Amino acid sequence: PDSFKPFTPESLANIERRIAESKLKSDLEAGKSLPFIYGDIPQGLVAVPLEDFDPYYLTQKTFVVLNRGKTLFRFSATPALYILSPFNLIRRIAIKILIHSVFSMIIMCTILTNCVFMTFSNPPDWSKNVEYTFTGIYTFESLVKIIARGFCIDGFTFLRDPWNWLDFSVIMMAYITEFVNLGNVSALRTFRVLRALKTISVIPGLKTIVGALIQSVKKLSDVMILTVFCLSVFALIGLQLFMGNLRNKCVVWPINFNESYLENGTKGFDWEEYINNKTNFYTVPGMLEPLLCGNSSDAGQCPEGYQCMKAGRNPNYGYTSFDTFSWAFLALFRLMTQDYWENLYQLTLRAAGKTYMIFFVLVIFVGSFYLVNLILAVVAMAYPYWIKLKEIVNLIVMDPFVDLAITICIVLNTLFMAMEHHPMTPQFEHVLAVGNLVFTGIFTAEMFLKLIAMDPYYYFQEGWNIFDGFIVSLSLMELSLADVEGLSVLRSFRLLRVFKLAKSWPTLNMLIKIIGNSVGALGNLTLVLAIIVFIFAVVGMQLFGKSYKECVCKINQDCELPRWHMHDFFHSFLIVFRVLCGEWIETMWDCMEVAGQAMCLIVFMMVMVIGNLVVLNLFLALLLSSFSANLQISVIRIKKGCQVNIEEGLGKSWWILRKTCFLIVEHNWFETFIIFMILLSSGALAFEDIYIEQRKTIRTILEYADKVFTYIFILEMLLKWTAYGFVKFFTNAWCWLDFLIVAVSLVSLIANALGYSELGAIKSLRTLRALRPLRALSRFEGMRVVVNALVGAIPSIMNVLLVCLIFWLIFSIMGVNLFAGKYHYCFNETSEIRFEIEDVNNKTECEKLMEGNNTEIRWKNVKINFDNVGAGYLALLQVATFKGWMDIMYAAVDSRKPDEQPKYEDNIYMYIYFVIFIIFGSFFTLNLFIGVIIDNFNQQKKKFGGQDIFMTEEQKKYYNAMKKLGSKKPQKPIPRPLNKIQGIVFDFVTQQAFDIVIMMLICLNMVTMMVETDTQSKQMENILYWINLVFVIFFTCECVLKMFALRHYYFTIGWNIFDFVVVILSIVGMFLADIIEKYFVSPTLFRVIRLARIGRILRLIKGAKGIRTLLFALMMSLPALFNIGLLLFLVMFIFSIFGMSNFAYVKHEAGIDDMFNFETFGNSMICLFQITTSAGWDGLLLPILNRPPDCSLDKEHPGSGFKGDCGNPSVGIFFFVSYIIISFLIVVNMYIAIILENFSVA
Amino acid sequence: DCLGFLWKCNPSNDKCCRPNLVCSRKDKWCKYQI
Amino acid sequence: DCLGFLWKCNPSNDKCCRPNLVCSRKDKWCKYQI
Amino acid sequence: DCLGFLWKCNPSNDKCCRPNLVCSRKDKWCKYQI
Amino acid sequence: GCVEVDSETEAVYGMTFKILCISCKRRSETNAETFTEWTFRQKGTEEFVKILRYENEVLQLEEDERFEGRVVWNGSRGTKDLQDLSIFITNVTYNHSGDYECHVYRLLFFENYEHNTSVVKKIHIEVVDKANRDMASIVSEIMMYVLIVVLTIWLVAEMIYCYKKIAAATETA
Ligand SMILES: *[C@@H]1O[C@H](CO)[C@@H](O[C@@H]2O[C@H](CO)[C@@H](O[C@@H]3O[C@H](CO[C@H]4O[C@H](CO[C@H]5O[C@H](CO)[C@@H](O)[C@H](O)[C@@H]5O[C@H]5O[C@H](CO)[C@@H](O)[C@H](O)[C@@H]5O)[C@@H](O)[C@H](O[C@H]5O[C@H](CO)[C@@H](O)[C@H](O)[C@@H]5O)[C@@H]4O)[C@@H](O)[C@H](O[C@H]4O[C@H](CO)[C@@H](O)[C@H](O)[C@@H]4O[C@H]4O[C@H](CO)[C@@H](O)[C@H](O)[C@@H]4O)[C@@H]3O)[C@H](O)[C@H]2NC(C)=O)[C@H](O)[C@H]1NC(C)=O
Ligand SMILES: CCCCCCCC/C=C/CCCCCCCC(=O)OC[C@H](COP(=O)(O)OCC[N+](C)(C)C)OC(=O)CCCCCCC/C=C/CCCCCCCC
Ligand SMILES: CCCC/C=C/CCCCCCCC(=O)OC[C@H](COP(=O)(O)OCCN)OC(=O)CCCCCCCCCCCCCCC
Ligand SMILES: CC(C)CCC[C@@H](C)[C@H]1CC[C@H]2[C@@H]3CC=C4C[C@@H](OC(=O)CCC(=O)O)CC[C@]4(C)[C@H]3CC[C@]12C
Ligand SMILES: *[C@@H]1O[C@H](CO)[C@@H](O[C@@H]2O[C@H](CO)[C@@H](O)[C@H](O)[C@H]2NC(C)=O)[C@H](O)[C@H]1NC(C)=O
Ligand SMILES: *[C@@H]1O[C@H](CO)[C@@H](O)[C@H](O)[C@H]1NC(C)=O
Ligand SMILES: *[C@@H]1O[C@H](CO)[C@@H](O)[C@H](O)[C@H]1NC(C)=O
Ligand SMILES: *[C@@H]1O[C@H](CO)[C@@H](O)[C@H](O)[C@H]1NC(C)=O
Ligand SMILES: *[C@@H]1O[C@H](CO)[C@@H](O)[C@H](O)[C@H]1NC(C)=O
Ligand SMILES: *[C@@H]1O[C@H](CO)[C@@H](O)[C@H](O)[C@H]1NC(C)=O
Ligand SMILES: *[C@@H]1O[C@H](CO)[C@@H](O)[C@H](O)[C@H]1NC(C)=O
Ligand SMILES: *[C@@H]1O[C@H](CO)[C@@H](O)[C@H](O)[C@H]1NC(C)=O
């Protein structure tokens, strides 16, 4: 060590002799700091050519240079461009500049200034002068590299670093195009955005992050193969079932041949023009697409005078369909990612029938199994007076009471700000102003006293002190200056004082750690996400910026821009931020219409894939970092200053009487009988739909059976009382719950017998019968274990729940200050247009239009708004879940001063409030929740000592046996037949080649299915019939042949029976299909029977060792998922009955229509399953919030005694919010369960 | 001339010195401008 | 001196910041050992 | 001032210092005379 | 919404009776203009004869002593889009036994298109001197008692049998 010497010519001559000797017969790398062992660079040996410090390739024609920062560089000693030798002064000067840090800083500042200039849609004229400044800097940067090192000579040169390829291409492309001064602007404009990628190479520490993320891809190829294969199987299932179903339409029927004019005229008729003329279809007034229908008994209905036919094109410009494998494959990628899947869910059910809901339940369940694998794949890779006064004030400051009192004032101050609302009376407003004035004075005095107590202005300024001092100055200036008062955001900074509580609330402090990491330890990973989103925003704006305005009439009816577009940077960025939230299909339809499908599909999918990959990596990194690791004394000083004998006649009898009660109650025969009646009475609740009047007989039967059921449960309660005793009976919660349900039933029974059946309280007590199914929770041991596990985590959930509430409270108060009373708008009901500011500017002009008989003009309000903190919480929940957040966001950007008519995007920069909340209140908040759930469920498992918590004792032994059955490797018998002919046939059928022929021919069969299309001509259908026939013939011969060699040993192998049982379905499927196509016609059965052919494609699992190990891991979790699935069904059933009793008559509006409503048990379950994924729960709640004149309080329902179609907003909010929370907790436990099995498997 | 840069004020009555001072829309005393 | 979360590291004398990080024998970059 | 050598142009519509740099339809650029 | 329900069959002499005639249209959001005509065939008579017509929110009663002064509207009101066409007899007499037909003529107004529909609903009313109770209530009332007792004797029977066993075992030792 400590060996330095300038690279002299004799050094090179020695090197070229050294290589001769070697040929005739190392953590020290470039770009890394020199190790401490070598010591500091000599006093004058810095920034010059030196000798290599390692023996690793010491004999190569190489030399080294150093930097004042002790960083290392390596160069090839051969002359640059065959002229510039290392010993020339030409290299030395450029070498001194290339290595200098200041040179890099200029380049970094150059690109940052350049990338900002890329955000301009139409830059001013002088931008060209700035444009040529950049190319001047970039071209100079390359020259220094070229003059300091070789251009492309072997070894280490300019072009041997891949990043310099982009740098060279960027510079040359600018010269050839700009100076030629001709080209397609929208085509070559995008190549400049490559300049943005230069930030990756320049900014330290970003190259490693991107390199890791690129090599992060090759881990997922195993799961990518799985995901594509399964998506193709369900795409073939969905394609077969729903060919042409999404282009059913209600067309006027019968044909009026007299009134028909074909486009050619002549008063003729032409069928092809009939079913393609839009005017012949039915469109529900106010909708944008024609209505779908179906010929089934459970599908949609057409009005009178219309017929259900296949006509026109598929919905959503034709991009939503199952008519082709490519369009079927896209529809299932949408369903896998749950992007707007409720609309595809509802469109398919409206055309294929409600009985097909099973398909969407199945695809949604398995689609969740893919995601767990994808998340686990990436996880596997991150895992005088001055003195006298100073002492006096210092003696009161820093006292625990002073700190304690100020902390209380912070809590009291926050609660004071929550009282602000709209509309607010003058007296209430005055109290808020006076109270707020006092609070600012208290904190102003606090910092002034602490400013004096600590030596003036010097010791006070530290982390927390500067912040609250900044707040105090801001509040004082706001009280003085009108310009400060101009903007509403300033009041929010007071809310940040709430975090001052983190020093005493560990869970709140745990949230600061997560936020701090995102810009601390993981700053570079976060910065890559910022650069990735910026590049996509610029790239999309350049490609599609023009198209969104040229083709505007193609995607909007009014020939004006939609609310989401890429015509400028800010709106381009918002779309990119929107897909990261999971909403990409809706914005891709618009882009495909204007800019074509090929180029739009490619970019939108790269954003979805690359964008979500980086977000997921950041989320997992934050979690794994979270897993890393005087109030009382002040109170103390305040504190300072009967029993009948059993061993006798009756004692034997009475004690024996209690003993026999226990024997009967515990007896399994008795318990099973009671469980049978809990299902019978619970199932009798499903008949109370809007059609009960048509079921006079069934209503009478179930009315009397209710007496029998409630009598039996009374006896069960009495028997349990004696068997256990009052002390034991009233000690456990399960017996308390059963008691409560019985008591409620008796009250409604004796009261009903006495009378008062129409009493309001009794009627509202009758609706509580929906809780009767809760009596089954303790009777099924699968439900009890899951419920017990959930309750054990409640104390942990609550502590994190409080942080969520307090954190969300700040955003709720801040949003109130910005949007309170600014969501109102004047609406012309009869024509359905919000008035423009020219017509009505404020509430006053809207009122003047309401004079007289003008009942069509209304001063309406957006139902979900920020009028107060309570209403703010509901709005935040809709934003956090990304359901209904579009209406909330639209009203915010339109808002103006209170009581002013909204104007289109007058406040466009209010989108940032919702962007900030999603990043902080949703992304980080969910990180905190998962951080404790994972930790809590590990301690819960650990302290119990068991390997499972969602599984019963009976399932555990089955689980243990199944684990072994998947571990004992199969043997390899070779029972040769010892026959002349059967001997040879046995030999070759068992060779690996024979399997390869089978495997390949199945793939050709798979491809033959993808070629099918709805609109295919008969000739193509005729061909595809013969090809499929051959495959059936070929595969039966495979079984017959192997059943001829392995005549009796087939049962010994588990796949041959599957091969056989999959075969006999193929011959029956084709032979029976022909039979049903001529006699006993039943098309709905024909499609289902044809699905048997897809069984062959599943045989690929046999050779897919990559995917088999995960399908097996799925089977391990099924016993646990079954128990959780049961509890979800019970919760769905209970909430289903509540919906029918409350929302069965609300007005058909928004998300409530004639097929998806709460009028019937089937409809309620369909809607409840949809909400389970939190899909479109905003459109179901909105009709329930109606109040007159939006609804009629005395509307008539023919065939029923009910009156009115109004909802109950209070019950509607409680119903939907409660289920959203509950379904979230259960579904989160589902993921934890499957993840635990996979972790124990991997 | 002008009064002190802080003084009580009420809406619809611009008694503070003009045009420098303005009555606030939150509170009951005038405001400064720059 | 330290290597970052995703920095390439040398398993022999890995500089991945302990106790959180450790070199990957199979991927050649620091991972969370947790 | 004038549009430079090879500046964007049409055969009768250049702003360049023509004919010294003057337009042609083969490139729509004021190629410099030589 | 709208649910089609059939009318009751037996009307008690001396008191009122409501003849339901509900005909819901396939899609509820559509708008239409409907009017109805009622026709009646008395017991012991073969040909149907009109008895009233309702349209434009005004009821018209045909000249019939058996129905004059004792029939009033009981269906949908306040609109021309009728879906409930019931009528209410204020005083049932034996002249009112017979077959009824409730004709509904509905004209639907679509965009540049209108469809003239027609529906006929049939009702058969029999007059009795005293109200009867439906069989579903008769059979179910006894059944709940049979189930209640048959389950009560079963419970005590098992209690005694197990009481015999437990008492005997305890006294054995
Ligand atoms: C749900 O269930 C529903 C019920 O099950 C189901 O509804 C059915 O849908 C299908 C379509 O999906 C319907 O079938 C179509 O019906 C069209 C109309 O058919 C009627 O009109 C025809 C033409 O009328 C001319 O001829 C009559 C006889 O001479 C005259 O009386 C007419 O007047 C007229 O002649 C002259 O008079 C006019 C003045 O009055 C004058 O202007 C005019 O120009 C002319 O000079 C009739 O031929 C037809 O009669 C046939 O069919 C009925 C049963 O439907 C039989 O009873 C008859 O005995 C006879 O067989 C009807 O009266 C058809 O036009 C249409 O046919 C065309 O398309 C099909 C393919 O879809 C072709 O096979 C066919 O050859 C026709 O092809 C046309 O285009 C091709 C190019 O592609 C061209 O080469 C060719 O020359 C021709 O132009 C088709 O059959 C069906 O009617 C619906 N109802 C029923 C009950 O079935 C619904 O689909 C289901 N929905 C779902 C989602 O499942
Ligand atoms: C150690 C182990 C211990 C285990 C102990 C047991 C734990 C698990 C069970 C707990 C029991 C919780 C039950 C609480 C239910 C309260 C609901 C309630 O009091 O509601 C009442 C309201 C009243 O309505 P109204 O009279 O105004 O209607 C008027 C309508 N007119 C006009 C037609 C009459 O009802 C409505 O509003 C209807 C809409 C609102 C519905 C709210 C939710 C109701 C259902 C809850 C199901 C809970 C399932 C839990 C599963 C397990 C999870 C872990
Ligand atoms: C008792 C109750 C429990 C109470 C506790 C609940 C906890 C939270 C309450 C609400 C959270 C759960 C609701 C939810 O589901 O939404 C969260 C979502 C789950 O998946 P989603 O499919 O919904 O989101 C689309 C996935 N692509 O996570 C997300 O991705 C949110 C979207 C954020 C990602 C978009 C871009 C942001 C990346 C950058 C952000 C940080 C960058 C660093 C800046 C310094
Ligand atoms: C975390 C969540 C659950 C916060 C919930 C807070 C509630 C205690 C607040 C927030 C919204 C409040 C409601 C907002 C508006 C109104 C209308 C208000 O109407 C009137 O006063 C009548 C008209 C008048 O002002 O004279 C009656 C109280 C009420 C229901 C409020 C009751 C108390 C609520 C539910
Ligand atoms: C709709 O159809 C009804 C009958 O189905 C028409 O009413 C009849 O009209 C004719 C005249 O065309 C009269 O002679 C009959 O007496 C009417 N019968 C009844 C019961 O009213 C009605 O006019 C048709 N409406 C339209 C617009 O075509
Ligand atoms: C179109 O109308 C013209 C004018 O009568 C006629 O000559 C021609 O045959 C028509 N074409 C068709 C395809 O009906
Ligand atoms: C569609 O039908 C209407 C009604 O007959 C007609 O006015 C219109 O011209 C037709 N359009 C086309 C494209 O055939
Ligand atoms: C509301 O719209 C209707 C229909 O276009 C129009 O007649 C009416 O004048 C509008 N109201 C006002 C106040 O302009
Ligand atoms: C409402 O706006 C009008 C002009 O559109 C204006 O003259 C009037 O003073 C405003 N009134 C209020 C209360 O804002
Ligand atoms: C029916 O009319 C009779 C007279 O014919 C009268 O006595 C009786 O009270 C009436 N009852 C009703 C319900 O109209
Ligand atoms: C009923 O029929 C009898 C038959 O004689 C007749 O006298 C009577 O007027 C009819 N009407 C009534 C209301 O009784
Ligand atoms: C039917 O007529 C009776 C006659 O008094 C009336 O009380 C009742 O309200 C009517 N019912 C309807 C639905 O119009």
Short mmCIF file of C-alpha atoms in Angstrom, two decimals, chain A residues 877 881 883 1135 1171-1175 1177 1214-1225:
data_model
loop_
_atom_site.label_atom_id
_atom_site.label_comp_id
_atom_site.label_asym_id
_atom_site.label_seq_id
_atom_site.Cartn_x
_atom_site.Cartn_y
_atom_site.Cartn_z
CA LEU A 877 -63.29 7.00 2.17
CA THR A 881 -61.08 3.26 -2.24
CA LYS A 883 -64.95 4.48 -5.93
CA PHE A 1135 -76.47 -7.96 5.15
CA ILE A 1171 -69.46 -4.70 -3.12
CA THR A 1172 -67.28 -7.38 -1.50
CA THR A 1173 -64.56 -6.27 -3.93
CA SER A 1174 -65.62 -2.67 -3.14
CA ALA A 1175 -66.54 -2.35 -6.83
CA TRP A 1177 -70.34 0.82 -3.99
CA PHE A 1214 -74.28 2.86 8.11
CA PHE A 1215 -75.18 -0.16 5.97
CA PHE A 1216 -72.57 0.43 3.26
CA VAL A 1217 -69.76 1.71 5.49
CA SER A 1218 -70.15 -1.20 7.90
CA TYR A 1219 -69.98 -3.84 5.16
CA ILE A 1220 -67.02 -2.16 3.47
CA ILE A 1221 -65.05 -2.28 6.72
CA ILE A 1222 -66.11 -5.84 7.55
CA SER A 1223 -65.46 -7.27 4.09
CA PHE A 1224 -62.05 -5.58 4.09
CA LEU A 1225 -61.01 -7.27 7.34
#
